[PDB]
């Protein structure tokens, strides 16, 4: 017996400082939300990071947390996801669905200057990749979980051309989980066998 239900929250965001989890996981219910570095504790549309505390927080993270400002705005219109840079400092996003959409290396990191926006995710694109992946085996489908996960950095970029080579080296970074695509992946994973 298999039963499925539409998720209440279309995504969940986890905040990270260096390689450590800081704060609780935030689940976005509204189609629009802002991830800022301020201190509002009771806003279902704002993921205020300024109030999260880390006893092992160093100096450079403290300085980086001051430049988040208005942070990033995420909206989910139709079947596509966008990230808008409201911060006075550029943000760096690593979205496999976006990277593949343009024929870039999977680890590619996109810089979003203040005021600009970008098509972070596309449901139709993912559905197409999920279809042509059942022909490559369990491994290919299992690794499609990273397609549902997206990582962003608030001030400092990482990857090639930079000194930080991994996202765990950036002072302030988050990781999104797209519940919609994740549920579609579950339907296909069960049928893939071992």
């Amino acid at each position: 017996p298999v039963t499925y239900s539409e998720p209440a929250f279309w995504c969940s965001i986890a905040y990270y400082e260096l390689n450590q989890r800081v704060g609780e996981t935030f689940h976005a219910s509204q189609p629009s939300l802002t991830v800022d570095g301020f201190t509002d504790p009771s806003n279902s549309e704002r993921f205020c990071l300024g109030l999260l505390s880390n006893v092992n927080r160093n100096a450079t993270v403290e300085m980086t947390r001051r430049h988040i400002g208005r942070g990033v705005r995420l909206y989910y219109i139709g079947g596509e996801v966008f990230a808008e840079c409201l911060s006075d400092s550029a943000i760096f996003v690593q979205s496999p669905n976006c990277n593949q959409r343009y024929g870039w290396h999977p680890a590619t990191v996109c810089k979003i200057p203040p005021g600009c926006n970008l098509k972070i995710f596309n449901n139709q694109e993912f559905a197409a990749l999920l279809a042509q992946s059942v022909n490559q085996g369990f491994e290919a489908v299992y690794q499609l979980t990273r397609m549902c996960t997206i990582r962003m950095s608030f001030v400092k970029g990482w990857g090639a051309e930079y000194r930080r080579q991994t996202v765990t080296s950036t002072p302030c970074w988050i990781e999104l989980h797209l519940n919609g695509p994740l549920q579609w992946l579950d339907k296909v994973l069960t049928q893939m066998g071992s």
Partner: peptide, 20 residues
């Protein structure tokens, strides 16, 4: 390609077009 899987993915593609 597992036959049950390809049909499951085929339904997913139909859903995405409805959203568009």
């Amino acid at each position: 390609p597992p036959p049950a899987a390809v049909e499951a993915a085929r339904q997913i593609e139909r859903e995405a077009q409805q959203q568009q």
